[PDB]
Amino acid sequence: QTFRRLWPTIAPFKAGLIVAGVALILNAASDTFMLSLLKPLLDDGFGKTDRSVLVWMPLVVIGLMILRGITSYVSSYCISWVSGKVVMTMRRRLFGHMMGMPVSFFDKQSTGTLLSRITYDSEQVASSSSGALITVVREGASIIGLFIMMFYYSWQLSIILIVLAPIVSIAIRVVSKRFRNISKNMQNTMGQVTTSAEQMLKGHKEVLIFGGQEVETKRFDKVSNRMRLQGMKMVSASSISDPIIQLIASLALAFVLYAASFPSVMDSLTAGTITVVFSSMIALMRPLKSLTNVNAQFQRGMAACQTLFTILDSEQEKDEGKRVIERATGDVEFRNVTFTYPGRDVPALRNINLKIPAGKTVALVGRSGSGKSTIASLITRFYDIDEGEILMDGHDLREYTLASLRNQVALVSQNVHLFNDTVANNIAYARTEQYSREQIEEAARMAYAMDFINKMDNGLDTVIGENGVLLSGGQRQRIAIARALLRDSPILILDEATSALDTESERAIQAALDELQKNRTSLVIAHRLSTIEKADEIVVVEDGVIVERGTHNDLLEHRGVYAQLHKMQ
Amino acid sequence: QTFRRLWPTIAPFKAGLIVAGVALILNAASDTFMLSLLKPLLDDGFGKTDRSVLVWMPLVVIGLMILRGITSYVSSYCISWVSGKVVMTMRRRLFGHMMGMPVSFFDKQSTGTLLSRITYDSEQVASSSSGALITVVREGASIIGLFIMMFYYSWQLSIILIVLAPIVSIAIRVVSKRFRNISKNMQNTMGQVTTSAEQMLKGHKEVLIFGGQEVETKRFDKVSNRMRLQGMKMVSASSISDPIIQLIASLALAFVLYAASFPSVMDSLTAGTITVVFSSMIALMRPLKSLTNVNAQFQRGMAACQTLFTILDSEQEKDEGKRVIERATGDVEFRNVTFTYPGRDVPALRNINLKIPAGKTVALVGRSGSGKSTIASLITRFYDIDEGEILMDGHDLREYTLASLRNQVALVSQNVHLFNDTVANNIAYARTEQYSREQIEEAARMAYAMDFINKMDNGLDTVIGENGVLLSGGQRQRIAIARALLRDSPILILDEATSALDTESERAIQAALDELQKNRTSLVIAHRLSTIEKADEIVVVEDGVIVERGTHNDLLEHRGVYAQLHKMQ
């Protein structure tokens, strides 16, 4: 169905398919013709000469279905490798859906969407490989059991099991429907086990540090019991499906009783051998069980790949296209640009038409919490949606090829999202192309005895707590400055990094980058006097509105806000 | 084996066990006695009177094994519910292993250890339920097929299939061994898929904000291909196991050829009916396939519950026991206490014997990054290991019942670990017992127009980005102060929370808590003049050593460090 758009994937796939199918074909050859042993065997009194070739053949056929063992295995390996590689493909590509998602909403929720990957993934693997393989094995045996019976034995007897097979068919049909539905929406509901995992992330150290130890327990209570009884729900749904196929195997098998009874009532036939055919009948219902269980388990397979295609696709929006911006610095000017993240809530910026040149490194100012941060995601184009619009350098903000554009600017956030790392990465990361640890060594050392860890330089291969845990804030803070010591891009901007820092390496890095980078606009906020005197221009934009700008020295008298800023401290 | 310590879990379990077992017993009754239909059926020429009761019975037996359908289902539901509830139990309890782990090492790594839960969990469920249930169904049919053959038919024929069954036994034995081993260490190796998920967490927004878009791809390259070819590795290992049981079903089934041949060579018997018994032989090898696949899949089951018991247990260390500390404030004094997190690296604190009373709220000072933070985890007893030792109030730090002890102090970290939240939690969380939103309303409002979000108070039910994303830093910072507006405990301490804050609500909360809490020692660091004048005592402890303390006013001349601190800014 949708399975038909599963179908395009690739051709060598088709090869493994044919491999397994013909394999089962050769499961069937000696199960049916197995009956073509027992069949003439049993009737003829074996005589001796008949007993001769008879007693001879089991050696042969036994070599034959043990052969069917190895062949079966072959096809198993091949198709398995096929299936696996398919999973591989999806996992990456739809990871290109999730990275393909990115930030604007992908802000909202994180690790629920995460576990989509791992645990909307693995069980779909198992269901795919296991389920599919076990399904295939079945119906060749069943089918052949029918056909051999039908024409290869008897025609009104054909009418018999072909009374079964259409009706049987519609049975698998309705089962496939009701159940593909129910357990489909099930795994939809189990994505809330992914919720569970997500929240139990959010445990981490926090409750531990308040001493709230029993609310966790409550958390796994509400969701865990719900989802676990949920599992039992669909297990009972499964063993409910096994009857509905069994009750049609009860009416179907029962119709073999009619087959058992009706010629028995009036036999135009010789029972004789064809009695043997009934053995197949027994064998026929033997795989029955598996299917239900299988299908249930396998139903999973169709289902999340389903939701991954469907629910997984959207929004890597675009770029009009260009080059990179050269390191030649543009000028940052916007027109009537304002936004707020939520909804009907009015834009957090009141409104603004940006203007600055580059080479003017201006002190940005506003009382915090103000969406003062927004310009970043704005200017970094985290948000394309623009009330008012931007052509920077006579060409619009969104005409600029994505990374190449973003190769205009780097930044330090209000805070740090970092890795477990040695010197290896979050310094050397920014663009790994230069990892040179001469160049990295002293390049980070351009944060000037951030090279110094405490009375030490770290065993430079020693990895860190992901956000830095293993020591107090300063050094990692300085790292968060250090990522910008490397990549240079036609404009750079930094903010609020100084949190626990000393004033020393702070200011020395101020003038240091000044010297280094004069001619980019470098924009920043401070609660300290640090840049607010020395930034070659000053601007105070508070909340979503600019109160003032120009040279701060004008603004100590011109307003009281900056005055008191200094005047207090 | 270890399965024998799986065994203690509970009794109603035993009930469901008996349920399923006797169930399969009644699968078997009419498969064997099914042969006890075909058997006398086929030989006797049916006559009519023989044909009468014969053609009669299929109605009966067909009602009987369709009965076996419903019975089978019953036992399925019951045992399933059993298995599920067992999983539930573990998931919580060993979550009490992981919380049972806590911080000291549990610092080191987070979300790899995480996915242990979800994806060392779910597949173990599937393997448990599915695998176990499918296993049980098998050997009752096999066994009975043997026994009915052995004594219920023929004794030297007993010798036949009991030539099989011991040898067959040792076959399942070696399979169980080699494979329990190999796929056991496999899932050990797949816990590195949990690694994968963990790192792809660490993608989140960071690379996105640098523009490093192709290193991710590399990350799923190295691990993803490895683990996926790893899956194929154990799939091929499985379909390698199916032969080794098939080659002993090739030698075993082949020994049925001997059974087929040897009496055929010289028959002391009447073949006749007992020819029919061979049908069972065919049916016998029919379940064969499943086991291998099953066992492989099921092997998973033993395995992580294995590693969960084993690898999951340790360290909720202890408490000597006491009451809570009363809100009556102790005095914080240590003896020769110093530590550093890493290894052979010498303690980050040089050494210290703490002393302060409570009611003295002292300005703690040191250049940051210095392990200045450590005292927290120290004093909060995140680290029991103490070079030098502590009896605070003549009774040791570790004599104090855990939370109750920690009910002496609350704190704001150097940073924020928070939730998606409305007003609902991270303010109201601290101890949910008072969520009172009068009391919460103005209790958080004790952060004084932190009540104010921007020109607004949030729709007070509006949840936030987990770390607060939806607006700039200030308000959530103030929240991180607000968690301490509620819980009071015989001492409180706060640090570095003011990061983007204004000075206004900062200082007003300073004196506000002063007024409110005088008589606890309240200890803090600042890069601002804020508390450094007004903290009723002053201490500068830099790096792992105390340089100075007393009244700062003594220390502006007495050292230059504080002087310049002010004197610069």
From Swiss-Prot, chains A, B:
Q: Where are the transmembrane segments?
A: 6-26, 53-73, 143-163, 243-263, 265-285
Subcellular localization, as worded in the UniProt entry: Cell inner membrane
Q: Which reaction does it catalyse?
A: ATP + H2O + lipid A-core oligosaccharideSide 1 = ADP + phosphate + lipid A-core oligosaccharideSide 2
Give the principal location in a single coarse category: membrane
Show which residues constitute the signal peptide.
none
The entry's family comment says: Belongs to the ABC transporter superfamily. Lipid exporter (TC 3.A.1.106) family.
Please report the name of this protein according to its UniProt entry: ATP-dependent lipid A-core flippase
Origin organism is Escherichia coli O157:H7
Q: Which gene encodes it?
A: msbA
